[PDB]
Each structure stands twice: as structure tokens, then as C-alpha cells.
Design a protein around this ligand. Structure first.
Ligand SMILES: [Zn+2]
Length: 103
């Protein structure tokens, strides 16, 4: 009974100039104990390092990510944690370009 497995590929939606919604599913493998929260990370397209996209983990399976740079392209990934700790991350989401209202 250890940490969870990866969630499935997250989905990104409701993209504005500096916010987006990231949604995902509960990992198929919870490691044998209840999922207590999720880490969400982001990576600018063709940058190497993944960084925190939210200040602290969330419990719901979606969140509004803020503080994104207009004109930049980002991908997101999600890691689940249980009482035993953090599991490996999901595969990266599709990338999204941060652009303001197209109308
Ligand atoms: Zn954690």
C-alpha cells in the first residue's frame, strides 16, 4: 500500500489571456488508500522544467490555473497523492496558447 499511480491525460479549457481550467480523472490505481489531493504543474512549450501551477494541492478534479503569461503556450500535468505520498505525474495535456477573448 503505497502512493497512487498517474491520472489520465488532463484536459484544458476556458482559456483566457492568463487563466485556464485544467480537469482530470481519478487515477485508476490509488495505491490502496484514499486520494487526498492533486498537484498540478505547468510547462511552457519547449521549456524543460515543470513548475507548480497552483499554490497548494486541490481535492476536486479540476481547478482554475492563474498567473499564466499572455502569448505563451503551456501544457499541464497532474499528480495524485494519498497518505503514503505523491505518485508519478500524468502525461502532459495538449498545449494551449494564452490568448484573450477572440470576440
Ligand atoms: Zn503533495
Amino acid at each position: 500500500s503505497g502512493p497512487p499511480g498517474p491520472p489520465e491525460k488532463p484536459e484544458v479549457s476556458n482559456v483566457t489571456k492568463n487563466t485556464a481550467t485544467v480537469s482530470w480523472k481519478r487515477p485508476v490505481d490509488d495505491g490502496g488508500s484514499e486520494i487526498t489531493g492533486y498537484h498540478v504543474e505547468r510547462r511552457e512549450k519547449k521549456s524543460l522544467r515543470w513548475v507548480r501551477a497552483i499554490k497548494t494541492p486541490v481535492s476536486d478534479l479540476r481547478c482554475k490555473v492563474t498567473g499564466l503569461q499572455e502569448g505563451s503556450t503551456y501544457e499541464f500535468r497532474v499528480s495524485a497523492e494519498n497518505r503514503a505520498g505523491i505518485g508519478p505525474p500524468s502525461e502532459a495535456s495538449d498545449s494551449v496558447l494564452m490568448k484573450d477573448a477572440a470576440y
